Amino acid sequence: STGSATTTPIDSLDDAYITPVQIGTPAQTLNLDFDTGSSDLWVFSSETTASEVXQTIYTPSKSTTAKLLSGATWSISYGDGSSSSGDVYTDTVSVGGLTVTGQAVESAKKVSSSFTEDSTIDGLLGLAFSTLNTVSPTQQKTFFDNAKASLDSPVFTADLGYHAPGTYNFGFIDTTAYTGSITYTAVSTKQGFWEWTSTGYAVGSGTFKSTSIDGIADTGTTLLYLPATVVSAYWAQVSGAKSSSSVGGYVFPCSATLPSFTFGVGSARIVIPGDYIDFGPISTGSSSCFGGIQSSAGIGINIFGDVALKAAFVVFNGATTPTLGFASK
Ligand SMILES: CC(C)(C)S(=O)(=O)N[C@@H](Cc1ccccc1)C(=O)N[C@@H](Cc1c[nH]c[nH+]1)C(=O)N[C@@H](CC1CCCCC1)C(O)(O)C(F)(F)C(=O)NCCN1CCOCC1
């Protein structure tokens, strides 16, 4: 089997992407944030504290296939400090025509303020390794782990657009969606992430420096977070850019034409166009814009977030020994 779903940016900044997911029988359609940085599928629901709901909710009691997973609970917090918790049902879940029976659907009893305030995200679908799932006492498998037995090939691909829709495919590689060939690189699963090592970087039309950069491929993070000295090297080429303590990172004049940024995948090179690094104005009508490449020093891990992934066709190869593939597009 295979599945193919359109994913759409939630706003004009590409802050996040949402993908429709059908849950239950008859299907309830929710728009979820596919996150390769976590492993929980959780949704707003009829159980969520009413004052914290502003979103489309899942109602397990209107699904004939929903089953309560007795005595299971979950609690998660994310790197930006947001959190949620609740109980667990199993139910039928379909993405793009690909159906999984018996999927753990984590129902939120409580959600943090950030979740309440974002009307466009009805929940998260985690696509990291199942060791990071937060259900207790027995962890639950991710949608991808449950689908692998049925998939034509144990892969999914991410084709995120720049201020445009893109596609998540399950079970096949669309050879029309990229150019050249795919280069694969080893994944370390020790921390539960799609963790890989980039072979170097270049800024604009300058030299490529071979330097290993360990980081994670994370669809659920907006920006590109890299070591402080790499990031300083990038913004040194932008005459009006400065690190702003009040805004929380590097800012630059919106009128600037930004240099591209290249990262290494083995012997291959992926080029992020300068325009992708212009995240946007710090506020409407401002003359100052926020940068899309920022320092990872405060995070503790380098993150190849949407700014980087949307410049590439990305293959998450879910075989027993996983790998990550990148192609230009
Ligand atoms: C709107 C920025 C002004 C560009 S922002 O950073 O706030 N954007 C958020 C994403 C966003 C967009 C739109 C609406 C809401 C949220 C962002 O990029 N968040 C990152 C920031 C980060 C990472 N690390 C340090 N800081 C993040 O937490 N991403 C997580 C998924 C997000 C969470 C908020 C809602 C959207 C999905 C994440 O899962 O990708 C993660 F990998 F970073 C992470 O937190 N992984 C959680 C690991 N769990 C921990 C518990 O044990 C199990 C493993």
Side-chain angles (χ1 to χ4, degrees), residues 32-47:
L32 310 186
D33 190 347
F34 284 21
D35 179 23
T36 60
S38 70
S39 304
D40 286 52
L41 194 173
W42 73 261
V43 296
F44 278 83
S45 69
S46 49
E47 303 180 330

Side-chain angles (χ1 to χ4, degrees), residues 10 15-16 33 35 37-38 77-80 82 115 118 121 124 132 218 220-222 299 303:
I10 62 169
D15 274 299
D33 190 347
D35 179 23
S38 70
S77 57
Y78 300 94
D80 57 28
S82 60
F115 286 118
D118 185 4
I121 294 166
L124 272 65
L132 293 181
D218 189 359
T221 291
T222 311
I299 292 166
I303 309 182

Side-chain angles (χ1 to χ4, degrees), residues 71-271:
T73 52
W74 60 281
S75 165
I76 190 160
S77 57
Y78 300 94
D80 57 28
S82 60
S83 57
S84 51
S85 61
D87 51 20
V88 192
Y89 291 79
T90 54
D91 210 341
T92 303
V93 175
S94 308
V95 174
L98 170 70
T99 304
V100 176
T101 59
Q103 175 59 225
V105 179
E106 303 168 36
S107 172
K109 295 201 139 240
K110 301 175 290 189
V111 300
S112 66
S113 294
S114 49
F115 286 118
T116 298
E117 294 158 1
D118 185 4
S119 68
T120 62
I121 294 166
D122 304 324
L124 272 65
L125 193 144
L127 289 168
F129 294 86
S130 293
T131 189
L132 293 181
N133 181 86
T134 73
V135 179
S136 190
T138 288
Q139 285 190 137
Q140 302 304 123
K141 285 183 297 253
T142 63
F143 175 82
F144 180 44
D145 272 8
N146 288 136
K148 274 179 203 172
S150 308
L151 287 173
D152 290 2
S153 183
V155 278
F156 70 91
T157 62
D159 187 3
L160 307 171
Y162 171 70
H163 301 309
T167 302
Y168 279 103
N169 297 147
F170 285 84
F172 72 105
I173 294 167
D174 185 1
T175 66
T176 67
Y178 58 94
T179 59
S181 63
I182 301 166
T183 296
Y184 290 95
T185 196
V187 165
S188 175
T189 61
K190 186 186 187 298
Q191 299 229 73
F193 297 122
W194 296 87
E195 189 177 352
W196 67 286
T197 298
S198 176
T199 45
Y201 74 98
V203 177
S205 60
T207 53
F208 183 89
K209 322 279 203 310
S210 175
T211 178
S212 293
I213 304 160
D214 185 307
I216 68 176
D218 189 359
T219 54
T221 291
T222 311
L223 302 181
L224 179 50
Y225 297 91
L226 292 176
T229 58
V230 174
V231 177
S232 272
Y234 181 80
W235 293 108
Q237 298 304 305
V238 181
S239 55
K242 61 163 211 181
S243 174
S244 158
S245 195
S246 58
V247 183
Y250 286 91
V251 302
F252 67 98
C254 296
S255 58
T257 306
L258 296 180
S260 61
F261 182 87
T262 296
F263 58 94
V265 188
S267 42
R269 310 282 178 255
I270 299 285
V271 180

